[PDB]
Amino acid sequence: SMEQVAMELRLTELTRLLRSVLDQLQDKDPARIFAQPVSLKEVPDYLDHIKHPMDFATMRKRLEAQGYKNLHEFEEDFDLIIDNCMKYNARDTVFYRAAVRLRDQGGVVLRQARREVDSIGLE
Numbered sequence: 001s002m003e004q005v006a007m008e009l010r011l012t013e014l015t016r017l018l019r020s021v022l023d024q025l026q027d028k029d030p031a032r033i034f035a036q037p038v039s040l041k042e043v044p045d046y047l048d049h050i051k052h053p054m055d056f057a058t059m060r061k062r063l064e065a066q067g068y069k070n071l072h073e074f075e076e077d078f079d080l081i082i083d084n085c086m087k088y089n090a091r092d093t094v095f096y097r098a099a100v101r102l103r104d105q106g107g108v109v110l111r112q113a114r115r116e117v118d119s120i121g122l123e
């Protein structure tokens, strides 16, 4: 149907926006601490601690499969990256502090993204 095509154009446009948002957020992780899944070879007990791991590469995979239907779903995954890190790692670690900085800086990008998604009506 034409409606289904219209919907898919919207989703494709959302994906384009979210890809821009994702690139901006990853730029706030210059140390690339959140670039890849935590290695279960390097941290064998990780899944005892963290029940829903997340990272930028996993997000990108979901993104390119157009698996984010709305900004909220994307934000949930970004929040998982930060929140998992701030639980597993203690306050006085380079890992925890990197998550705090990414959260604070990322907030700026997500604030405007929400306005853009609302404005261009992508949901």
Ligand SMILES: CC(=O)N1CCN(c2ccccc2)CC1
Binding pocket: 033, 034, 038, 039, 042, 043, 084, 085, 088, 089, 095
């Ligand atoms: C995202 C996060 O929480 N990290 C980064 C990956 N980690 C790690 C530990 C040992 C060797 C290599 C990497 C654990 C802390």
